[PDB]
Symmetry: C4
Subunit: 431 residues, 4 copies
């Protein structure tokens, strides 16, 4: 009967607790300033729910700084005591015994937001909503303080000016006509607008206005600098792509690069970006060593599994090693590659698309999916010639290995190399 | 009778459609709030044009996520249905049957802007114009809402204050004197100015003012943060050049570096930047492999094509191989280079400018454009001596190859090396 | 009887001097504008304290640009003279002899803040407090100038409007009711709010308002841009971690990467970040060469000190050499590594956690802390076979060395290698 | 009788021309709106000076895009014609023949600022002054337009409100009391303050206010974003140093690193930064190839010139080669280095400071400035031992060479090596 701290139940329970804390924090200052039955009913509901939360905290698991995993109620009690329980215990104190200031301790429940703030941060767009909610909460608190100051100093404040403006001279303005204007002034002072309908006129209201101006200016600047940061990150991924494209284009325009090869270069650029997205796979590859290096290579190592029968006998390490050495060339139909006579160092294979090698207007080796063609290895020791040049009917998304690397790795295995040598099958051997 | 989706006709057609959507979106809220004949004439024209657009969309091509190219009307119907047609179909519904709210569905045509937003996005300055137009559109909508609120609540609102200010007490202000002030207030509340001529005075106008203040503050911050971003990119290319220059100059000032060599170093810096612009060509070179690597090398591979007769017999692969190994040095007249006695490893060639090698006050090898001079290769195997030091009359923009690399590549070809050996011509052989 | 310039006594003394300078700078303009006894008492105390500071400056040490360390009173006098003494000497001039402008020279003591500004600068949050204090000080000075202008021009200024607003027509407003409003206006003009209670009405007040608007706009923009900078650095460390996580997750989602290996990869990522924090240790390692390179390597060089007896005889250089070649792999229980049959190149050791090698359902070599197991070296010269695959009970935070590197280093030492060869002890030799 | 375009005379002449253009641009709109004798006197002076400028432009040199250097009056006429002469010629047209609008063509002289804007940009702080001057100029133009609108529409505008506020009902306000308020309003609308003293009340003033609000908001945002950019660059050099220090400190705190070696590491960090300033010299070294690589190395190649007699016979290339291979170690007194028994690969030399090698409590080889000590080379072929460990009395800022590199380079020269071998002198040969 133990609850996991990362269980999805804790997520919805924390959502409920957060919403309840927001409700309390919003409703208590308004009640304090402007003011059985629903208020005490909701108070009792809140107290019972938070008591249930305090008790259920005694059962959930936790992660220690040293011990990654720790459970059972023997260790939760010592950790939870002598800690954040000081703030939480005073929050859930029900008493009836006006003197309504004692409910301000409920604001301490807002601390519960900060200690789980990390988990809410895994979404990126939620930051904007949380920041706007916090700004509205600060505005609400400042409006509460404004109204409190007005009431306490009015036993020519802003209350009389408000009564004059909207006709209700003194009766007086209603509670609704006294809270909307306070929040209006608070926003007009945090956003630095200053409409002039309501403005401080005494000696304490001006000091409060100065304090609000400073706090709001600081908070506004920092918050919307953060907003600019999140917005500019999302748009700056695309802006980095744009800068790469601009770099390529200015490099082209500086070196003339007439159209016929320039179109190949450009289209190569877009189609390559379609798969790489600017990310260099080698960087994240080198971060993960040994078998973790090849686990990424395992994802492109589904090519020759079903296209070679002796290939199925490979062990984990052998398969890893043969996977790590494959290279991938990307070329949409229209890009021609090396041909006979030149260096036939790399043994060209296929990954996707199709290959239609043309040996002097004769199509040979029509293979499309992870097939085995190429040149002999141990009998050449020389960059000879092939049947004909490569041709591009479909995408030339193909695999490559290297003569030296492949011969070295095939000399590496004592027995796996013998097994592969027992069945050296090639779909089309093009001399 | 099929139209290409990337044809230039689609560009001007989408310009026309965009302008028409802007017209409708601007003119419908004003008509809704402040209000045969021209209005219905334009309405009919808009409906007919957008119906024509809907039908012509049934013929243009499209690009699938998987299939790069796909055409013919068999596949356009299934893709276009069950998609964005839901928003587009309701837009083009003409009916006469006041209740003018039903035209608000025309605002859905603005969605057509978003789905082609990428096609506008290659231009850099167009972002500013689009952002300003969107800001003006939001201001127009907020002014419309402001006027609607004023009219509905006035059967001491801002309308009476406006009538008092500009003398027309109530007749009343004209439609022109009622729309300019609303847009004025909307801008004075989005830009956070707050002049005080017009200001909310009731309980709904203040709530609307708070909402406008929040929305405008957020939009203003984000939009002009983006504006700052585009401005700082364009100015920060030059600022990056400035920082490179600052790095160079602080490095010079930290190490004294008296004038005689410092002027050479500096002038080298500016003239090198004039050609490279800070861009490292090797970085973009390595992005394109195999023949895509040498396509860039082909652009500087026009030196010995017209300056050597056996050079014309090279195949594409041989040409690529010989092009990839060339290096280029830039030195305007005034920079002296290596001379006799020292390592004559690299075989110095020419690319531009002119070379006037001086062998002890005797000028030899006066060659300017992609000429072949240097030292013998197979008979030295030793860094011997040359006729004299290099001299700089014109720019020393010259080619270089390496002894080891050149001998290895000339040993690489079985037959091309034999052909080149058959005609080993040098313009001036300087021992 | 000499005081060190970096002694902690100087820290508290400079704190006291700074606080006294702030006191003087705050209190002198207010006295100048709005105005024995405590005023002269404090004046005398300030003068005496700053005289004591001037004399004690004649004894503290200093650091020359060329000479890092220099002391004794012979050299302090020549350096301190012909320097900043010109500003400091005029500050401490007591005279009684109204003409209260002569106290403005005390503002020169604020220069003492700038010359020790670096010593405050290691803290990060202190920048915010200093910036806010400077902003408040500028606001105070501008309020002083505003009140001075008002008084000098009033022998329909803002003073009469203030007297009208808060009822005290003219007696007149009190000194308290005349300073709060001036500072209020100064803040409402620096923050760009413009409430409208107090506003310039003459021809000099408008010029002053323009000057204040320009200065405040510039200072506000620069200061809160800096505030945004410090905020975004602290939050952008976490944002850089977030971007790394986003890169990893988009790379995973682009390549499918089903759950069974994806969970291993992810958990590897978080636990690796827990130890490296994104910092590449090799970068800072390469900054320090020779023995400074191995000092960092000495911190992980406490493994075999207590786990091998001949290991204690190593000199400092031998210890450095053996430490620099060790590698560390992190794998919490759940990650399997290379096994028998595959390349047993690296000699696997242990650093933390525990190792429970399983040789065909038989557990062998149960070693947890910096233990020595593996394979023989000189008798294989071949990647042979081990007892069984590695197993993960506890964290596989383990050391590794390389066959070639270890054999080369053991061939390097003439005598240390002989000593190690004399006692070649292995805790569990697994063939 | 030709003037160089980069001569310092052109600098002061351009300063004078710029100041004159600023004078004209400031004074013409004010004269146009608010208005022999000084005005025509200054007009004649300006016309004569700009005619002199136009003629002197016919003699100065210029730089073509292709030709770096070009002079003589034959080529200046063709280039200067069909170009920017269209704007410049209309500027200098004197005529007497009110209709004062024709002087607006003088604003075209402001274009002269843009075409020489690059040369003013080599200073960094001048950007702030130029931006502030441009902002003031835009404010002046907008105030001019405001006053023009007011006068033309007043045959209840802002003029009547101004006359009411400052008591002069209508006579009317003076020209001084009509220009200060216009500029006041223009600044209060560009900075987004909105005091409320003067505010638009008609239907054209509100449109003008909207236009000014938009333009000023855009310009203000962009300009102070640039201001933030320049400020943050200068402070972000120090912030990058701070981030490097923080990286080092968090790396230390994560790995404990007790005090004794930690103080060495830290002090190493600061003293190394004292010379490197975070700049990696190798990066700028590799940018300059061949002899330009060694010219930087020439600046530290003043060590052994005066400390070795056969060293004076080195040629340019030999000296370059011997310079490029020297390494520099920096260590303040307190850092101990490698000693006898360990690898004596590097041949330790001296650059600055002093060296006091201690061979078992015996001080030997007391050499301080670029001296020659070390171990024999051709007779060891083995990492033997030295007399004693290195000791740090003064800064261990010393040179190093490598055994393999030094032996290879001394085998490289056929004759220079023979000359050096003829005199192989060592100040102190420590076995």
């Amino acid at each position: 009967w133990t609850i996991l701290h990362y269980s999805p139940f804790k997520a919805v329970w924390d959502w409920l607790i957060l919403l309840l804390v927001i409700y309390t924090a919003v409703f208590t200052p308004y009640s304090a300033a402007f003011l059985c039955q629903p208020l005490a009913v909701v108070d009792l509901i809140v107290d019972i729910m938070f008591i249930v939360d305090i008790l259920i905290n005694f059962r959930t698991t936790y992660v220690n700084a040293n011990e990654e995993v720790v459970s059972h109620p023997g260790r939760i009690a010592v950790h939870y005591f002598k800690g954040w329980f000081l703030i939480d215990m005073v929050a859930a104190i029900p008493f009836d015994l006006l003197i309504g200031l004692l409910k301000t301790a409920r604001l301490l429940r807002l601390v519960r937001v900060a200690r789980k703030l990390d988990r809410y941060s895994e979404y990126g767009a939620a930051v904007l909503f949380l920041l706007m909610c916090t700004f509205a909460l600060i505005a609400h608190w400042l409006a509460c303080i404004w109204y409190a100051i007005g009431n306490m100093e009015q036993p020519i404040g802003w209350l009389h000016n408000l009564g004059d403006q909207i006709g209700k001279p003194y009766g007086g303005p209603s509670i609704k006509d006294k809270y909307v204007t306070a929040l209006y002034f608070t926003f007009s002072s945090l956003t630095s607008v200053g409409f002039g309908n309501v403005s401080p006129n005494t000696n304490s209201e001006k000091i409060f206005s100065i304090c609000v101006m400073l706090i709001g200016s600081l908070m506004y600047a920092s918050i919307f600098g953060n907003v600019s940061a999140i917005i500019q990150r999302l748009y700056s991924g695309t802006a980095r792509y744009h800068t790469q494209m601009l770099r390529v284009r200015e490099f082209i325009r500086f070196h003339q690069i007439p159209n016929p090869l320039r179109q190949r270069l450009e289209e190569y650029f877009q189609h390559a970006w379609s798969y790489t997205n600017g990310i260099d796979m080698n960087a994240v590859l080198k971060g993960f060593p040994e078998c973790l290096q090849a686990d990424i290579c395992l994802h492109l190592n589904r090519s020759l599994l079903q296209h070679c029968k002796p290939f199925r006998g490979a062990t984990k390490g052998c398969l890893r090693a043969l996977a790590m050495k494959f290279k991938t060339t990307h070329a949409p139909p229209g890009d021609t590659l090396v041909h006979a006579g030149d260096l036939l160092t790399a043994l060209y294979f296929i990954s996707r698309g199709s290959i239609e090698i043309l040996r002097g207007d004769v199509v040979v080796a029509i293979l499309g999916k992870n097939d085995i063609f190429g040149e002999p290895l141990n009998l050449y020791a020389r960059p000879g010639k092939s049947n004909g040049d490569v041709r591009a009917l479909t995408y030339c998304d193909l695999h490559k290995i290297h003569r030296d690397d492949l011969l070295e790795v095939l000399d590496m295995y004592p027995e796996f190399s013998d097994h592969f040598w027992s069945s050296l099958e090639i779909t089309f051997n093009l001399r």
